[PDB]
Design an enzyme around this catalytic site. Structure first.
Site, PDB file in Angstrom:
ATOM      1  N   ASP A 140       0.838  -1.193   0.000  1.00  0.00           N
ATOM      2  CA  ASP A 140       0.000   0.000   0.000  1.00  0.00           C
ATOM      3  C   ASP A 140       0.878   1.250   0.000  1.00  0.00           C
ATOM      4  OD1 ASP A 140      -2.223   1.642   0.106  1.00  0.00           O
ATOM      5  OD2 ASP A 140      -2.440   1.487   2.284  1.00  0.00           O
ATOM      6  N   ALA A 199     -13.548   3.207  19.357  1.00  0.00           N
ATOM      7  CA  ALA A 199     -13.829   4.633  19.237  1.00  0.00           C
ATOM      8  C   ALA A 199     -13.027   5.232  18.087  1.00  0.00           C
ATOM      9  CB  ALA A 199     -13.487   5.343  20.538  1.00  0.00           C
ATOM     10  N   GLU A 232      -9.232   5.074  15.608  1.00  0.00           N
ATOM     11  CA  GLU A 232      -8.464   4.043  14.924  1.00  0.00           C
ATOM     12  C   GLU A 232      -7.378   3.525  15.859  1.00  0.00           C
ATOM     13  OE1 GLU A 232      -6.878   6.774  15.632  1.00  0.00           O
ATOM     14  OE2 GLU A 232      -6.466   7.666  13.669  1.00  0.00           O
ATOM     15  N   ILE A 233      -7.035   2.251  15.711  1.00  0.00           N
ATOM     16  CA  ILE A 233      -6.023   1.630  16.553  1.00  0.00           C
ATOM     17  C   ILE A 233      -4.635   1.739  15.934  1.00  0.00           C
ATOM     18  CG2 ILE A 233      -5.432  -0.425  17.860  1.00  0.00           C
ATOM     19  CD1 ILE A 233      -8.396  -1.346  16.836  1.00  0.00           C
ATOM     20  N   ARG A 234      -3.735   2.418  16.639  1.00  0.00           N
ATOM     21  CA  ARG A 234      -2.367   2.594  16.173  1.00  0.00           C
ATOM     22  C   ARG A 234      -1.397   2.423  17.335  1.00  0.00           C
ATOM     23  NH1 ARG A 234      -3.254   7.923  12.273  1.00  0.00           N
ATOM     24  NH2 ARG A 234      -4.524   6.853  10.691  1.00  0.00           N
TER      25      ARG A 234
END
Ligand SMILES: [Zn+2]
Lengths: 291, 304, 304, 178, 291
Positions: C53, C271, C273-275
């Site tokens: 990507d 809730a 985005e997971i980072r």
């Protein structure tokens, strides 16, 4: 087919050793055309090539030259790709060519053009060039030989240093700027095709011969693996040697400093330096004339 | 080039003798002739003359009934005749294959049921239909395998071997073997063409030879019967005959200049058609030794 | 079928892990998740997560720069990341081949220059473009060789051997080997799909799976993130949230009836985005053990 | 001598008929709705159709094709196909010229087996021509010693194209051109 | 794929041994449809076939029958050609079929039709027929079994002689013309498909059983390698035996003489003789009724 070709080939070279050139040439072509008509290229290629060999060996440039062209035509008709075998046939024929053959250059061009169309080399196959170069040099076509050798193999590099060395020696009145006119060609040409290896080897062989013949005042300067044969009576050679290494660093600063110290040389090799500055220093700004 | 078929008539290696010639140019005759000349010159080898012409030309040429069952021509224990029917559009080569494959089954079948084995077969090709069309498919499709096999070699064979040159080797093997069935050695197989000195014939001949050359099939023999040579026969006269040969001489020169390195044997014209083992052997003698209208004139006005 | 990826996360045989999901359905997330779960469960094996990507999703997901040069994610000595650009119409398969062949050269290059070797690679398939199209050409063209090879066997091989089964064997050998690169063993290679309970997503998923099945590529894992489960969260209310899940529940049932024997792991919605490595591992734990909105509600409202 | 210079004698009818398949089909359900959003097409097509077919047919009373050959295998083969080709062009064909005929059974000065044998073969095929082309104008021309050249020798030989050649009486005219 | 198929196949036959027929059938078909959609026929074929086997083994004709049809659909969709493997799958399924299955005949027809479309047999594959015949006979479908056996293999011939022998025995009141009604079928049927070998073997096995059970007055007549069991109380059998050999000679005269001596029989087998006279004697003239 395989047993028939071999046979007739003798009755052909028999008509050649007998003097019957017309007979030998006429018969072979018509027969060769037949193979081509049936798309049996491979057969025609061996027949044609063999016929051309004998003709050239018999000092019959006329027929020999003609057949070479005919062979090439098939080469393009059979879409014969550039490889050892394909090149070999032409190399073997080029060796028997008379350096004075009125078609020489044409023959050479045709062969090389073929190599270009059926290879990934924009200017033709390297090995092929090595042979072509030598042939051109035999007919005193120096400038043409130089180009081919430049785009040739390692042996070409040696024959290019010999071509330039035998030329420098031919000069009756040698001067400080004379040795540069020849030596510079090696540094610039190889640097354009970005062949640092050949640029360094051609340099070493040429600078060593120059030292063992003219006995000029010098002293080898060594720094971090690199060496620069500092000539006390040839500034042009010193500048040129530094230019080579500079391009290898691909550092703008060094290129600018070298030119600013040798303002004169910077105007003599104006165009050349402009190119080098674009290929090794990403410079878009034209070369400002010093003088 | 000797204008004869000596080298072939005396060859003990050849085992595949082709004989073609569309245009009712005396194909049948030349076939029986070449078969008899080889059988008589090599009595230590069995020969087989087979035809596919629905007119049963071999049975009308010798004077005896010949069928799918090989039978020795009466009077010879070295020559045998075979008359089979080669029949009783999407993929090229297939149809031709089936046809030839069938004729060969009729050969091996007659070598088991008495006859044992024929060293050289004299193929009397059909009058029409390129029964040799499949003589190119095997090389064709195969070469396509090579373009297929190689290309299928994506970058590598580094990674192609990590997820999986047996392919580049077996291909070349299946390659040669195939090319060995068409090439079939020029010393083992050859093709003899028959015609006459006439426009239409030359046209038919020229193309026939091109067709065979595309099959890589050796061809160096062109038979030309019905020749007059009306300038030597002891009993001259007859403008009608002289005029006809003046035309035949015209084309004959085009044949001697078109096929310079070919075995162009010029056969003499006979009063009536040649039939019967006897009249055939005496006429086929000219295929071994050139016909001289100055001396051999007798042999011709004899078959009459 | 356990709605988890346990069997895969604890597998030491798998060495090819696919992860696809067009539609901005949280592909990047699932990829990093599956990679972390396997690396932590098997510290005795090196793993490599690679993406194509152009948005550099792996560098934005972990919080560190990842390039063509494989680098161990900070804090883990078992997981490694790789972000390469798979690019920097006549024959099918070719283009795809070149693309994949290049990515594999980037793999072996990073196993020589430190890293030595990765036991299982986590392929973070591109967002668009069927990078697995060449997963069918090798079997295709090959089978054509078989139709070619066999048919090329005119009547015989009686006469085909007289003019010349090495072809019928080497073919079958080049056949299996090829089919072994696509099949690549279901115990060695598998494909993990990612999606969400939404019309368009299902459409994209259904086709993706069909495509893989035509490649004979094993597929039995469907990730569905962004799920609400708004009927259990301790802090009910909000019609807006309840209505949305009523729709997600609609499709989720179509997924549990469409893929009955598939590993349909239903992931919870977070809730934001997971980072970051931390929030990722804590969220990936649900890929090993099913997520219970009744008890695991804390872990989610925690990542917030 | 070579090359089917009459190949284009079929394209005009070909491509045109394709227009008809094109024109009609392009008539989706209707012309109720095809006229509400927009038979001039079905008429102009039929007009461009006839005109075209009128350039090939070119009236059998206005255009015709004369074929030439001889009584010999290869010739018949060439003739048979030539005629098929023309028929596919709808081009009228009903004339087959056969020169070089011997008729060596009438010439006053018989003899010469060589000549008799050749005609026995020509007679064989000639019968295949009279049975193959029953309703065709098969004019059998006589063989001349040498080739006929010059306006004079040509007119005297072409007279047989108007009135049949009789080897029993016209034998003089032939042995005259010699 | 290969490791996944095998697995699920157990969880399927697990739902079957558990009673969950609906679940087992529904799940398998949808999954199978998926393979078919991706043209992965081979996979679907094994899955479907295996599923049908288990259903039939569990006495579940409903599902079993359905799957067979589905398999056939794929067979035609994948253009599966008729060969050992292809036939085997169907044979293995036909063996588990219940002779009373309400679909029996339909299942049989479907399989055979497939064999016809993908083979050079106008009526279907021989071996396949051998299995089909036995199945039909288990459901008392004698007439249908007879046809298939007639167009079956050597084993079929044996099962055809047993089908006719067990029928003749079933007759309470046997008569001179009764034994002919059964025996004649063997001679006529095999003579139509021109299978002299089967005609002779079926005859020998049937005539020997008839001699060891009824003990009729007879005497074997041997001439030039051929034999004709002359029954002293069964003229019909004598005529029939001569008819067989006659056809083998393909000589018009013999055929006419045999019929003229047995005028009565020539009218009983009017149509049959008419055919035989066309297939073995090239007779175009219809059969003139004697009575
Ligand atoms: Zn004459």
């Amino acid at each position: 087919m395989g047993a028939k070709l071999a046979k007739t080939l003798q009755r052909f070279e028999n008509k050649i050793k007998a003097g019957d050139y017309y007979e030998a040439h006429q018969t072979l072509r018509t027969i060769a055309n037949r193979y081509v008509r049936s798309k049996s290229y491979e057969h025609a290629i061996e027949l044609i090539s063999q016929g051309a060999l004998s003709f050239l060996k018999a000092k019959q440039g006329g027929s020999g030259t003609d057949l070479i062209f005919y062979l090439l035509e098939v080469y393009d008709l059979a879409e014969v790709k550039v490889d050892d075998i394909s090149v070999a046939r032409l190399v073997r024929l080029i060796a028997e060519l008379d350096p004075s053959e009125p078609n020489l250059k044409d023959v050479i061009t045709g062969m090389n053009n073929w190599s270009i169309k059926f290879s990934e080399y924009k200017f033709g196959d390297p090995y092929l060039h090595n042979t072509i170069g030598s042939k051109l040099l035999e007919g005193d076509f120096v400038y043409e030989a130089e180009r081919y050798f430049m785009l040739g193999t390692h042996d070409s590099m040696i024959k290019y240093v010999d071509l330039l060395w035998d030329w420098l020696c031919q000069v009756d009145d040698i001067e400080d700027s004379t040795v540069a006119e020849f030596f510079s060609r090696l540094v610039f040409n190889y640097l354009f095709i970005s062949n640092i290896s050949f640029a360094h080897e051609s340099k070493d062989i040429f600078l060593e011969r120059f030292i063992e013949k003219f006995h000029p005042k010098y002293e080898k300067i060594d720094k971090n693996g690199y060496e620069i044969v500092f000539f006390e009576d040839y500034s042009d050679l010193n500048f040129l040697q530094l230019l080579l290494i500079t391009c290898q660093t691909a550092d703008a600063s060094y290129f600018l400093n070298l030119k600013n110290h040798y303002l004169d040389f910077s105007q003599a090799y104006k165009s050349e330096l402009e190119f080098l500055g674009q290929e090794y220093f990403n410079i878009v700004a034209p070369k400002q004339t010093n003088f | 080039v000797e204008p004869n078929l000596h080298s072939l008539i005396t060859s003990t290696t050849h085992k595949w003798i082709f004989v073609g010639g569309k245009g009712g140019v005396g194909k049948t005759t030349s076939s029986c002739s070449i078969a008899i000349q080889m059988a008589l010159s090599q009595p230590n080898k069995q020969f087989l003359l087979i035809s596919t012409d629905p007119a049963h030309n071999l049975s009308d040429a010798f004077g005896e009934k010949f069928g799918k069952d090989a039978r020795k021509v009466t009077g010879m224990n070295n020559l045998s005749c075979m008359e089979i029917d080669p029949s009783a559009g999407s993929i090229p080569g297939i149809d031709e294959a089936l046809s030839f494959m069938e004729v060969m089954k009729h050969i091996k079948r007659q070598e088991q049921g008495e006859g044992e084995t024929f060293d050289t077969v004299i193929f009397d090709t059909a009058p029409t239909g390129h029964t040799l069309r499949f003589l190119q498919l095997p090389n064709t499709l195969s070469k396509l395998l090579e373009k297929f096999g190689e290309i299928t070699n994506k970058l590598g064979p580094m990674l192609n071997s990590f997820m999986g040159i047996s392919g580049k080797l077996n291909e070349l093997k299946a390659n040669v073997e195939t090319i060995r069935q068409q090439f079939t050695d020029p010393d083992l197989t050859t093709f003899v063409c028959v015609c006459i000195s006439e426009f239409l014939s030359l046209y038919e001949t020229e193309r026939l030879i091109q067709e065979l050359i595309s099959y890589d099939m050796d061809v160096n023999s062109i038979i030309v019967n019905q020749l007059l040579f009306a300038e030597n026969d002891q009993e001259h006269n007859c403008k009608r005959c002289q005029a006809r040969w003046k035309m035949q001489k015209k084309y004959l020169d085009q044949i001697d200049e078109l096929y310079e390195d070919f075995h162009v044997v010029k056969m003499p014209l006979c009063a009536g058609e040649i039939r019967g083992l006897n009249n055939l052997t005496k006429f086929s003698q000219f295929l071994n030794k050139e016909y001289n209208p100055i001396t051999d004139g007798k042999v011709i006005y004899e078959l009459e």
